[PDB]
Symmetry: C3
Subunit: 264 residues, 3 copies
């Protein structure tokens, strides 16, 4: 803490401010700027030309590419320099020009990214976002403020997710989409505004979901989208299904967090 490990490498052209913590076998490349409240974990690499600032904690074995901006002042017009936070986990691939901004006081104070994510060129994570584990944001994918992207979700290229929206686990959002409402777990969404196109079967298969689990999830999707019933009508029905198929509880948990209605 507030120490640069003797096995970390800091390029002579880099500027790491006194107070920064840099772990064993980390690598700060040329022309990087690292502020005094940053913590960079073991084995993390900033290739070159990376700016990291604010109250920002980055885990182990991350790879952050040139022209990325991590921890920076957010774009919220109300933000006025309060000491809000960014947390990033482990083994993320954070590509050229990615931006990850600090929270706002009003939004909870924290922008959080988990582990094993791929954030492709110019992906944007606004203030107060929460990204889980094993997600993909393709090139130019943009999360406006207060967005949640749950585990394994893919946000396609050139896609915007509007403020406060929740993207459930194992979702796939097609490229060139505008997501203006909440996307239930396990769903394929595409378009502007994005609408649902069935369950992400190929994803669930690849990720080892059982036959029974995928059938149950398709049954939950049909309750929401095909039954023609109200969401409040089908909530008990989905809970009843989840009593046998635990993967269906993700719908229940998602309904509790959803504030924008569902894409339809």
């Amino acid at each position: 803490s507030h120490m640069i490990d003797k096995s970390a490498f800091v390029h002579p052209t880099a500027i790491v401010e006194e107070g920064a913590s840099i772990g064993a076998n980390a690598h700060i490349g040329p022309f990087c700027i690292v502020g005094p409240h940053v913590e960079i974990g073991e084995g993390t690499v900033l290739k070159s030309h990376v700016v990291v600032n604010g109250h920002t904690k980055i885990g182990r074995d991350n790879e952050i590419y040139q022209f990325a901006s991590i921890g920076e002042v957010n774009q919220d017009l109300k933000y006025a320099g309060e000491p809000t936070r960014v947390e990033i986990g482990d083994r993320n691939r954070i590509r050229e020009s990615v931006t990850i901004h600090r929270g706002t006081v009003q939004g909870g104070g924290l922008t959080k990214v988990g582990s094993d994510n791929l954030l492709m060129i110019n992906a944007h994570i606004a203030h107060d976002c929460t990204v889980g584990n094993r997600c993909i944001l393709a090139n130019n994918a943009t999360l406006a403020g207060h967005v949640s992207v749950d585990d394994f979700a893919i946000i396609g290229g050139m896609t915007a997710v509007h403020q406060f929206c929740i993207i459930g686990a194992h979702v796939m959002v097609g490229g060139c989409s505008g997501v203006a409402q909440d996307v239930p777990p396990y769903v394929i969404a595409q378009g502007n505004h994005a609408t649902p196109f069935g369950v992400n079967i190929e994803g669930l298969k690849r990720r080892g979901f059982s036959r029974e689990a995928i059938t149950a999830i398709r049954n939950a999707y049909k309750l929401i989208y095909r039954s023609g019933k109200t969401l409040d009508e089908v909530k008990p029905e989905i809970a009843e299904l989840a009593e046998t198929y635990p993967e269906v509880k993700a719908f229940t948990d998602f309904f509790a967090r959803s504030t924008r209605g569902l894409i339809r």
Copy 2:
């Protein structure tokens, strides 16, 4: 002029060419490049890794973030190094990777941005554009050449405005739009190609327009879009309305500048 104020701060790693003017309490951060024909006003901050060049005048209390390119050679295939210009006013927040390019001789020689604007990540202002005051360009918003964005207008994320188009004052263009024709003042536009969706009532309310003014503006919108008359038929009618409600004159002034027809 051609002087660096004794109260300006220039990082030792920055490269400011002889001839540049830098005002009192300006701050040029690490790895910035500032060319010889640049003028930077009092209190302006280039955070780090900013390139400013060409015949470029930047006002007071701007905040320009890393990886921005301001004044650079434009993308017009006819441009051949002529000494065209950029002018930027005061109190702008110009975020990471924004690009603002110099004019072309054929297009009038000047790209101009006013004051109190927010240009979000990777917004683009092409050659010969004119942006007013208190505008917002959201992430990846792109103005192709010779575009005007009038005061208070918001261009949503991932939106392109095609060359020569005029966006009137207090417009809101939705995210993921393609604007291929002119947008009258006070209008909501969305889609690809963008089409009108009524007056920006919430914006006008927030910005202190009177009840009478907003009703008059809605009446002007109905003349254009609902009356089913020709634009040339309803111009006198809108001028007549403006004789009582001065805010309606913005329509008249806009018609005189519009060359691409109106979105419909």
Copy 3:
């Protein structure tokens, strides 16, 4: 080879690794990074803040702007550091934040860009892409992996081309498009997903195609899109037409490479 020409200029702040080849009257600007397996041809300019790495060959009289990343590790999840390649030809204008990534072993090992191209701000050329000569990628235009863009083709702003797709010569793809299938030569495409809108007549006229050639190309387009016949039905017919009008052979050559079907 492995030599810096005595007439090349390397800024003192640049970092060019031992083994890099830099030709006569090349210019490496401030804060550039050039790796040991890079070759930069005569007269090429890296303005500032450019990263060039990997097994990468860049020709003569290129202009590469700040915050570009050329030769970098690609975004393919299977790629694991294999010594794949980028080749770039001559007289390209490669604008701010452009990304051009190295190949994958599985995709053929090479990303290739020809000559006299304009790659506008934040254009992206993924692993295993092939871009010809005199192409334009407008701002934020994105080629996903294994895409071909043939000579004179224009990819509009904010447009994504999905993996493996082929864009034929003299195509124009409109801004804000998603191209999910193959685009025949000489065709205008727009939308999400992009659909065809006739032949690019204005382009062909500007580029000196004969009257007879343009009529023949329109006749080939009608066979594909208007005749209501199968593609396999009209292939002989298009070959027969090409026996008189050589420009129609581009259709034949294109059919042989197309794997995703045609946009329709």
